[PDB]
Design an enzyme around this catalytic site. Structure first.
Site, PDB file in Angstrom:
ATOM      1  N   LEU A  64      -0.704  -6.353   4.530  1.00 18.73           N
ATOM      2  CA  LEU A  64      -0.903  -5.167   3.730  1.00 18.73           C
ATOM      3  C   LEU A  64       0.185  -4.196   4.253  1.00 18.73           C
ATOM      4  O   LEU A  64       0.071  -3.679   5.385  1.00 18.73           O
ATOM      5  CB  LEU A  64      -2.308  -4.589   4.017  1.00 18.73           C
ATOM      6  N   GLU A 105      -5.817  -4.455  11.434  1.00 15.19           N
ATOM      7  CA  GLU A 105      -4.955  -3.320  11.652  1.00 15.19           C
ATOM      8  C   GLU A 105      -4.945  -3.085  13.149  1.00 15.19           C
ATOM      9  O   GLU A 105      -5.940  -2.658  13.712  1.00 15.19           O
ATOM     10  CB  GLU A 105      -5.500  -2.044  10.988  1.00 15.19           C
ATOM     11  N   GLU A 133      -7.128   4.883   8.042  1.00 16.26           N
ATOM     12  CA  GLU A 133      -6.943   6.317   7.660  1.00 16.26           C
ATOM     13  C   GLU A 133      -8.208   6.919   7.075  1.00 16.26           C
ATOM     14  O   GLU A 133      -8.492   8.094   7.263  1.00 16.26           O
ATOM     15  CB  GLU A 133      -5.711   6.457   6.737  1.00 16.26           C
ATOM     16  N   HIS A 175      -9.834   1.046   5.317  1.00 18.03           N
ATOM     17  CA  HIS A 175      -8.510   1.361   5.886  1.00 18.03           C
ATOM     18  C   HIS A 175      -8.631   2.362   7.020  1.00 18.03           C
ATOM     19  O   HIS A 175      -9.431   3.321   6.963  1.00 18.03           O
ATOM     20  CB  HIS A 175      -7.561   1.941   4.820  1.00 18.03           C
ATOM     21  N   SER A 227       2.665  -2.708  11.485  1.00 18.65           N
ATOM     22  CA  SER A 227       3.927  -2.361  10.825  1.00 18.65           C
ATOM     23  C   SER A 227       4.666  -3.590  10.371  1.00 18.65           C
ATOM     24  O   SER A 227       4.907  -4.462  11.205  1.00 18.65           O
ATOM     25  CB  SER A 227       4.834  -1.756  11.909  1.00 18.65           C
ATOM     26  N   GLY A 278       2.937  -1.035   4.552  1.00 18.88           N
ATOM     27  CA  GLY A 278       2.957   0.421   4.387  1.00 18.88           C
ATOM     28  C   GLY A 278       4.316   0.881   3.837  1.00 18.88           C
ATOM     29  O   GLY A 278       4.724   0.500   2.747  1.00 18.88           O
ATOM     30  N   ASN A 279       5.006   1.715   4.598  1.00 23.35           N
ATOM     31  CA  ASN A 279       6.227   2.342   4.049  1.00 23.35           C
ATOM     32  C   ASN A 279       7.334   1.447   3.615  1.00 23.35           C
ATOM     33  O   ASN A 279       8.054   1.829   2.742  1.00 23.35           O
ATOM     34  CB  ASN A 279       6.742   3.415   5.029  1.00 23.35           C
ATOM     35  N   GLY A 286       1.473   4.058  15.924  1.00 22.74           N
ATOM     36  CA  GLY A 286       1.645   5.443  16.419  1.00 22.74           C
ATOM     37  C   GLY A 286       1.401   5.648  17.894  1.00 22.74           C
ATOM     38  O   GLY A 286       1.271   6.783  18.357  1.00 22.74           O
ATOM     39  N   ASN A 334       0.813  -1.171   0.000  1.00 22.46           N
ATOM     40  CA  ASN A 334       0.000   0.000   0.000  1.00 22.46           C
ATOM     41  C   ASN A 334       0.880   1.269   0.000  1.00 22.46           C
ATOM     42  O   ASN A 334       1.508   1.619   1.043  1.00 22.46           O
ATOM     43  CB  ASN A 334      -0.921   0.003   1.222  1.00 22.46           C
ATOM     44  N   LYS A 383      -0.023   4.216  -0.306  1.00 27.99           N
ATOM     45  CA  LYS A 383      -0.690   5.375   0.313  1.00 27.99           C
ATOM     46  C   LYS A 383      -0.429   6.585  -0.556  1.00 27.99           C
ATOM     47  O   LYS A 383      -0.428   6.437  -1.780  1.00 27.99           O
ATOM     48  CB  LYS A 383      -0.220   5.610   1.756  1.00 27.99           C
TER      49      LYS A 383
END
Ligand code: NA
Ligand code: NA
Lengths: 247, 239
Positions: free
Chosen positions: A229, A164, A96, A94, A210, A231-232, A170, A9, A11
């Site tokens: 899924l 998730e 977000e 998602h 993560s 992320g960064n 965070g 993803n 993003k």
């Protein structure tokens, strides 16, 4: 055995040039798409460029889809539109979108229904907050969120669930692979209860906290975790080493 | 003021329908130095539409993120639009305010992001039926003053009045005049006279001339009439 499923993803990230570089590194990984699914989810306006650059062994999809069909919904992409473009996958629910864009369970249900009506495959996300986990409401919250849509699933290869762990995103908390496995097993039990045992055994349930080249194997080696899924880490050429954990 | 005619395709189109439509639009010989004509397809249709339309047509997207790049699933940043040479964004459209709870703070953030990134912005606002029965100038003023201090070049931001309450051309003209007064009072006389202020209510081939003729209406953000080949007569009314 369930087919593992590893998704990038991106993003809201990328330029035309950074995608050219990244997709070139991705294409250098030799893997067999009948043995695992690998899906990339660029930004909408990058979909055509990304689809053209990636080899056919990579699947592609978009990060959101409208709850409305075609018509006067300025800014939205309908499932009918995505189908006409042969966009294979959509991400729905998602965190977000729920956080910044007030997406609700009812929204997630309607988007899933639009998606399956238009032969899209859906990657549907849910998960509890730190406050919910600290009040010991993980199961209550997750059941409510999964029951919002799961009875709509008509083909257990074509809908993919994503846990998730928002309590571990965070917050300064880290979910262990054992903690994640227990939540995946419980998600699978919800599916068995609404949809059936063969159905629950067939559906992929991905971890969507993560994931990086270090922890990926400790996660996917868990019995009920079928992929991620990502992320960064999926913006890095080293994302291929994450895909390797599923090969 | 250079006139400005825009096709808002909203959530409509197939690859084939866009092939047919852009092929008809490309048959109109207009001079882009004289007149701005902008097409705003769905995001996933942008590449196909841009490749099909001759460069005399400008192109844009129907929304842009209030956030920069980073972890905002499903959003398109102004930085991404700049890199793709997307020339325009629509901001504040009533459908976003209505279905997607977009606010005045969101409009200002989105404008600031778009201008930081050298995008041109088509900024939309307008009062409801209830506000009209009771507040037109109070409401539109609150709305323009949400973002107007951010406009640095008055060619690059286009205002659009959407009569959510609905309008005659004469009633439209009055609001347009009011809007231009808001800009004049805030940013100055010369700035007010440079900015384009488009009509965003229902425009078709039968009303377009009556609207464009009005002193303070400088073109249109056009809905369903822009999905038809006859949109070319709409563009002609501004030529
Ligand atoms: Na596993
Ligand atoms: Na005029």
């Amino acid at each position: 055995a369930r087919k593992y499923f590893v998704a990038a993803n991106w993003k809201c990230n990328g330029t035309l040039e950074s995608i050219k570089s990244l997709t070139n590194s991705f294409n250098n990984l030799d893997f067999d798409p009948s043995k695992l699914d690998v899906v990339v989810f660029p930004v909408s306006v990058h979909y055509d460029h990304t689809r053209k650059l990636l080899q056919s062994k990579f699947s592609t999809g978009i990060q959101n889809v409208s709850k409305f069909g075609n018509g006067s919904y300025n800014g939205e992409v309908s499932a009918e539109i995505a189908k006409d473009l042969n966009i294979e996958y959509v991400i729905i629910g998602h965190f977000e979108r729920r956080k910044y864009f007030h997406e609700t369970d009812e929204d997630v249900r309607e988007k899933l229904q639009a998606s399956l009506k238009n032969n899209l495959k859906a990657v549907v996300c849910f998960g509890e907050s730190l406050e919910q986990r600290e009040q010991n409401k993980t199961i209550e919250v997750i059941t409510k969120q999964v029951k919002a849509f799961v009875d709509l699933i008509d083909n257990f290869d074509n809908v993919i669930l994503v846990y998730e762990p928002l309590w571990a995103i965070g917050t300064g908390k880290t979910a262990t692979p054992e903690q994640a496995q227990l939540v995946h097993k419980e998600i699978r039990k919800i599916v068995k209860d609404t949809c059936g045992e063969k159905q629950a055994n067939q559906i992929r349930i991905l971890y969507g906290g993560s994931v990086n080249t270090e922890n990926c194997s400790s996660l996917i080696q868990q019995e009920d975790i079928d992929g991620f899924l990502v992320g960064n880490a999926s913006l890095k050429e080293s994302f291929v080493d994450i895909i390797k954990s599923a090969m």
